[PDB]
Each structure stands twice: as C-alpha cells, then as structure tokens.
C-alpha cells in the first residue's frame, strides 16, 4: 500500500530553509498532522462560506478570506501576499 504523507515536501522546505538541519521521524509525524489539520480547517471554512453565499464553487477568494479569518494579523498579511504572488505567477506562466 502506498500511503500519502507530506514528508518529502517538508524535507524540501527544510533544505530550502535550513540546509544543515535534520528532522526526526516523530517531528515529521507532527508536521504531517499539522498540514492535514490546516487543510481540513481551511477547506471546511471555505465550504461554509460557499454555502453561506449560495455558491457551488471554491475560488481563490474564498480561500483568501478563509486565511483572513483564521490567521492573525501579520501572519494573515504575509500569507495573503505569498498566495496572491504565487497565484499571479502561476496565472502568468
């Protein structure tokens, strides 16, 4: 069975951030739990907004305002900037 986890992506991000640092297996389990939890929170809140506004599609605006609701001030600002930058460059490319 091929089980799915975000471990390789966390290694990639870590090497991007700390080339000379390593992660234990348990810390990777925690990180996977965190990523799954955040995905669940954001998708549930996006669905709640879509139903509140009688919509049947999740667009980047719903995700953006979900991030605005969930994250605190500076975190929300930086994450919104990062997401808009990435979406803009993916659209441009």
């Amino acid at each position: 069975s091929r089980k799915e986890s975000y471990s390789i992506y966390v290694y990639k991000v870590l090497k991007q951030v700390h080339p000379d640092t390593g992660i234990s297996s348990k810390a990777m389990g925690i990180m996977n739990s965190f990523v799954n939890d955040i995905f669940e929170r954001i998708a549930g809140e996006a669905s709640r907004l879509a139903h509140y506004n009688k919509r049947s599609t999740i667009t980047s605006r719903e995700i953006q305002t979900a991030v605005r609701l969930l994250l605190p001030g500076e975190l929300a600002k930086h994450a919104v900037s990062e997401g808009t930058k990435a979406v803009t460059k993916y659209t441009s490319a």
């Binding site: 907004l49 509140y52 506004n53 605006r61 719903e62 305002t65 605005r68 609701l69």
Partner: protein, 78 residues
C-alpha cells in the same frame, strides 16, 4: 465613544452577575475587555461582509462571526 459605557451600566451588569462590591478600577478593566471582544467580533463580521461584496453589515454576518468564536446566538435568524 468608549466613555459612553458609564459607571452605572457596569454596576448594573455586575449586579445582574451577582456582584455585591466593586472596586474603582473595574470600570476601566471592563471597558478594555469589552473593547477587545468587540474588536474581534466586528473584525470577523466585516470580513464576512467584504467577502459577500457588501457595504452594509447584516445580522447574518454577526451570527456567523459569533458561531466562528463559539458564541452561538439563537433568535436572530440562525
């Protein structure tokens, strides 16, 4: 506009809460706590309104913002 919450009003709220004697700094402390609460709730409501592309804050935005905090309110269309 935060002065509008007068000392008698805080006294009344404490009496309905069963409080028998009140210090003198309780009023400022309560004003600060209320300001924090209202700031959070109105920020969430305005987020909902902006998302709905409106310029008016409805009762649904307040109800969903309270459901977001966990302060579910009955009797306003929920």
């Amino acid at each position: 506009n935060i002065q509008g919450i007068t000392k008698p009003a805080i006294r009344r709220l404490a009496r309905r809460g069963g409080v028998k004697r009140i210090s003198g700094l309780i009023y400022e402390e309560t004003r600060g706590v209320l300001k924090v609460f209202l700031e959070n709730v109105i920020r969430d409501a305005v987020t909902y309104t902006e998302h709905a592309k409106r310029k008016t804050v409805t009762a649904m935005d307040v109800v969903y913002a309270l459901k977001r905090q966990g302060r579910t309110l009955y009797g306003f269309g929920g």
